[PDB]
Design an enzyme around this catalytic site. Structure first.
Site, PDB file in Angstrom:
ATOM      1  N   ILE A   1       0.772  -1.237   0.126  1.00 24.02           N
ATOM      2  CA  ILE A   1       0.091   0.012  -0.099  1.00 24.02           C
ATOM      3  C   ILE A   1       0.811   1.296  -0.078  1.00 24.02           C
ATOM      4  O   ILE A   1       0.493   2.092  -0.345  1.00 24.02           O
ATOM      5  CB  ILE A   1      -0.955   0.128   1.225  1.00 24.02           C
ATOM      6  CG1 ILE A   1      -1.872  -1.272   1.057  1.00 24.02           C
ATOM      7  CG2 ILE A   1      -1.627   1.206   1.325  1.00 24.02           C
ATOM      8  CD1 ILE A   1      -2.542  -1.298  -0.298  1.00 24.02           C
TER       9      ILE A   1
ATOM     10  N   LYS B   1       0.356  -2.683   9.006  1.00 24.32           N
ATOM     11  CA  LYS B   1       1.629  -1.952   9.066  1.00 24.32           C
ATOM     12  C   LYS B   1       2.795  -2.634   9.728  1.00 24.32           C
ATOM     13  O   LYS B   1       2.598  -3.181  10.825  1.00 24.32           O
ATOM     14  CB  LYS B   1       1.185  -0.781   9.688  1.00 24.32           C
ATOM     15  CG  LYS B   1       2.372   0.476   9.732  1.00 24.32           C
ATOM     16  CD  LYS B   1       2.000   1.744  10.632  1.00 24.32           C
ATOM     17  CE  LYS B   1       2.863   2.760  10.193  1.00 24.32           C
ATOM     18  NZ  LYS B   1       2.614   4.045  11.086  1.00 24.32           N
TER      19      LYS B   1
ATOM     20  N   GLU C   1      -8.711  -2.573   9.993  1.00 25.80           N
ATOM     21  CA  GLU C   1      -9.383  -2.798   8.941  1.00 25.80           C
ATOM     22  C   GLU C   1      -9.308  -2.089   7.909  1.00 25.80           C
ATOM     23  O   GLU C   1      -8.609  -0.921   7.875  1.00 25.80           O
ATOM     24  CB  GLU C   1     -10.973  -2.097   9.754  1.00 25.80           C
ATOM     25  CG  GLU C   1     -10.893  -0.531   9.649  1.00 25.80           C
ATOM     26  CD  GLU C   1     -12.139   0.022   9.936  1.00 25.80           C
ATOM     27  OE1 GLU C   1     -13.086  -0.423   9.205  1.00 25.80           O
ATOM     28  OE2 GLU C   1     -12.442   0.589  10.792  1.00 25.80           O
TER      29      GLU C   1
ATOM     30  N   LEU D   1      -9.764  -0.050   4.118  1.00 27.61           N
ATOM     31  CA  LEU D   1     -10.557   0.684   3.447  1.00 27.61           C
ATOM     32  C   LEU D   1     -10.063   0.905   2.065  1.00 27.61           C
ATOM     33  O   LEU D   1      -9.017   0.642   2.016  1.00 27.61           O
ATOM     34  CB  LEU D   1     -10.512   2.240   3.943  1.00 27.61           C
ATOM     35  CG  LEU D   1     -11.776   2.158   5.156  1.00 27.61           C
ATOM     36  CD1 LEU D   1     -11.374   1.826   6.508  1.00 27.61           C
ATOM     37  CD2 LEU D   1     -12.224   3.439   5.201  1.00 27.61           C
TER      38      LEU D   1
ATOM     39  N   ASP E   1      -0.690  14.190  12.873  1.00 32.86           N
ATOM     40  CA  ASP E   1      -0.192  14.156  11.566  1.00 32.86           C
ATOM     41  C   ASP E   1      -1.098  13.956  10.415  1.00 32.86           C
ATOM     42  O   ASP E   1      -1.198  13.025   9.692  1.00 32.86           O
ATOM     43  CB  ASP E   1       0.994  13.122  11.310  1.00 32.86           C
ATOM     44  CG  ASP E   1       1.742  13.312  10.135  1.00 32.86           C
ATOM     45  OD1 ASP E   1       1.735  14.503   9.692  1.00 32.86           O
ATOM     46  OD2 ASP E   1       2.266  12.433   9.461  1.00 32.86           O
TER      47      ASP E   1
ATOM     48  N   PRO F   1      -4.183  14.236   3.749  1.00 34.29           N
ATOM     49  CA  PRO F   1      -5.168  13.529   2.814  1.00 34.29           C
ATOM     50  C   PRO F   1      -4.942  12.070   2.682  1.00 34.29           C
ATOM     51  O   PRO F   1      -5.809  11.282   2.646  1.00 34.29           O
ATOM     52  CB  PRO F   1      -4.993  14.455   1.461  1.00 34.29           C
ATOM     53  CG  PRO F   1      -4.711  15.687   2.064  1.00 34.29           C
ATOM     54  CD  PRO F   1      -3.762  15.464   3.124  1.00 34.29           C
TER      55      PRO F   1
ATOM     56  N   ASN G   1      -3.739  10.085   4.953  1.00 34.60           N
ATOM     57  CA  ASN G   1      -4.475   8.865   5.979  1.00 34.60           C
ATOM     58  C   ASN G   1      -5.639   9.433   6.291  1.00 34.60           C
ATOM     59  O   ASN G   1      -6.174   8.883   7.476  1.00 34.60           O
ATOM     60  CB  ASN G   1      -3.322   9.096   7.211  1.00 34.60           C
ATOM     61  CG  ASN G   1      -3.081  10.714   7.626  1.00 34.60           C
ATOM     62  OD1 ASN G   1      -4.055  11.272   7.812  1.00 34.60           O
ATOM     63  ND2 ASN G   1      -1.862  10.778   8.200  1.00 34.60           N
TER      64      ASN G   1
ATOM     65  N   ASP H   1      -3.733   5.844  10.650  1.00 37.05           N
ATOM     66  CA  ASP H   1      -2.413   6.201  10.944  1.00 37.05           C
ATOM     67  C   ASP H   1      -2.122   7.482  11.840  1.00 37.05           C
ATOM     68  O   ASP H   1      -1.349   8.362  11.419  1.00 37.05           O
ATOM     69  CB  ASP H   1      -1.613   6.491   9.545  1.00 37.05           C
ATOM     70  CG  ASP H   1      -0.098   6.378   9.589  1.00 37.05           C
ATOM     71  OD1 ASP H   1       0.330   5.465  10.279  1.00 37.05           O
ATOM     72  OD2 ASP H   1       0.672   7.125   8.886  1.00 37.05           O
TER      73      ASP H   1
HETATM   74  C1  LIG Z   1      -5.979   3.611   0.897  1.00 38.76           C
HETATM   75  C2  LIG Z   1      -5.709   2.444   0.335  1.00 38.76           C
HETATM   76  C3  LIG Z   1      -5.236   1.194   1.296  1.00 38.76           C
HETATM   77  N1  LIG Z   1      -6.385   0.798   2.315  1.00 38.76           N
HETATM   78  C4  LIG Z   1      -6.090   1.149   3.440  1.00 38.76           C
HETATM   79  N2  LIG Z   1      -6.675   0.650   4.761  1.00 38.76           N
HETATM   80  C5  LIG Z   1      -5.918   1.016   6.081  1.00 38.76           C
HETATM   81  N3  LIG Z   1      -6.626   0.863   7.168  1.00 38.76           N
HETATM   82  C6  LIG Z   1      -4.892   1.798   5.785  1.00 38.76           C
HETATM   83  C7  LIG Z   1      -4.443   2.301   6.996  1.00 38.76           C
HETATM   84  O1  LIG Z   1      -4.753   2.082   8.156  1.00 38.76           O
HETATM   85  C8  LIG Z   1      -2.810   3.296   6.913  1.00 38.76           C
HETATM   86  C9  LIG Z   1      -1.853   2.771   7.528  1.00 38.76           C
HETATM   87  C10 LIG Z   1      -0.673   3.765   7.592  1.00 38.76           C
HETATM   88  C11 LIG Z   1      -0.670   4.776   6.669  1.00 38.76           C
HETATM   89  C12 LIG Z   1      -1.653   4.960   5.885  1.00 38.76           C
HETATM   90  C13 LIG Z   1      -2.797   4.371   6.098  1.00 38.76           C
HETATM   91  S1  LIG Z   1      -4.607   2.099   4.210  1.00 38.76           S
END
Ligand SMILES: C=CCNc1nc(N)c(C(=O)c2ccccc2)s1
Length: 294
Positions: free
Chosen positions: A10, A33, A77, A79, A123, A126, A128, A141
């Site tokens: 991601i 993560k 979870e 998204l 922090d 857009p 996060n 995040d």
């Molecule tokens: C936006 C596309 C990836 N789907 C994601 N779902 C979650 N839950 C994410 C995060 O929780 C995340 C963790 C670190 C940095 C940015 C997003 S990214």
């Protein structure tokens, strides 16, 4: 991990790498993560607990935390899209006001919740802020600077975005407040409206000066105590405040009034998430569903 099968990378987060993964046993799809260290904090693993106990429709759910092999894994979870991608995909036509208003309202609910539980994000950007097909938007995040604390950038080679940093952070305040999240969200609100970052600084001083050139160089009158801040320099240039109507056209007066309160220099004058929720701008708020191309 062995219990998880990577689907896609991601991105390279603030602390580590983020992958879309499937629980090889439950079939559940999640965002994983991975975190880097030789000591491993304690105030952090407990600070992470606060995050895991957070339950709110506008906050990404932290499902599991796994510490093993000098690596720390946080399972969230999943998204399907982030607000940065959605804004880019909507740059030609712009995000319709009702949806901008819905997103802002939901994010303020999320912050109001975090803040009443003494949790700061630190922090917001857009990238996060995650959205789904149902019209929801959620905070993801969380910073957790009260743990590792952002040193230089990350742990390899990635340019940290300063565009949404509150002035008090840029001026060296060590004990910032919930107000820093309101500032970041105001910057995001402006960006959704104009389709251009409000303060796109490429360095800490350029970031600070872009803010000054727009809102005016702060002084003791608008921000009591500002000249006593760690990195404040009497030598800062003195810029006059620009007319606010040039800032976020063609946003209406209710929207501009709210934005101005979210961008007050003085953290103690900046509106709270709870008070913002009661602003006249939200009198006609609804919950539209976005057109998402996944
Ligand atoms: C936006 C596309 C990836 N789907 C994601 N779902 C979650 N839950 C994410 C995060 O929780 C995340 C963790 C670190 C940095 C940015 C997003 S990214």
């Amino acid at each position: 991990m062995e219990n998880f099968q990577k689907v896609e990378k991601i991105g390279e987060g603030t602390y580590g790498v983020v992958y879309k993964a499937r629980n090889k046993l439950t079939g559940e799809v999640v965002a994983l993560k991975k975190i880097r260290t030789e000591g491993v904090p304690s105030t952090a693993i407990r600070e992470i607990s606060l995050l895991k106990e957070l339950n709110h429709p506008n906050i990404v759910k932290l499902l599991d935390v796994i510490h093993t092999e000098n690596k720390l894994y946080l399972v969230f979870e999943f998204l399907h899209q982030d607000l940065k991608k959605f804004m880019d995909a909507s740059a030609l036509t712009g995000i319709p006001l009702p949806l901008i208003k819905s997103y802002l309202f939901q994010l303020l609910q999320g912050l109001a919740f975090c803040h009443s539980h003494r949790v700061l994000h630190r922090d917001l950007k857009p990238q996060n802020l995650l959205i789904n097909t149902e019209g929801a938007i959620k905070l993801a995040d969380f910073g957790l600077a009260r743990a590792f604390g952002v040193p230089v950038r990350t742990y390899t080679h990635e340019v940290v975005t300063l565009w949404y940093r509150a002035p008090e952070i840029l001026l060296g305040c060590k004990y910032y407040s919930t107000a820093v999240d309101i500032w970041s969200l105001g910057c995001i609100f402006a960006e959704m409206v104009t389709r251009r970052a409000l303060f796109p600084g490429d360095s800490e001083i350029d970031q600070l000066f872009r803010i000054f050139r727009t809102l005016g160089t702060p002084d003791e009158v608008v921000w009591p105590g500002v000249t006593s801040m760690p990195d404040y320099k009497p030598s800062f240039p003195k810029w006059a405040r620009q007319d606010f109507s040039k800032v976020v056209p063609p946003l209406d007066e209710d929207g501009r009034s709210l934005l101005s309160q979210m961008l007050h220099y003085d953290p103690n004058k900046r509106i709270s998430a709870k008070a913002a929720l009661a602003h006249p701008f939200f009198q006609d708020v609804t919950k539209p569903v976005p057109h998402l191309r996944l």
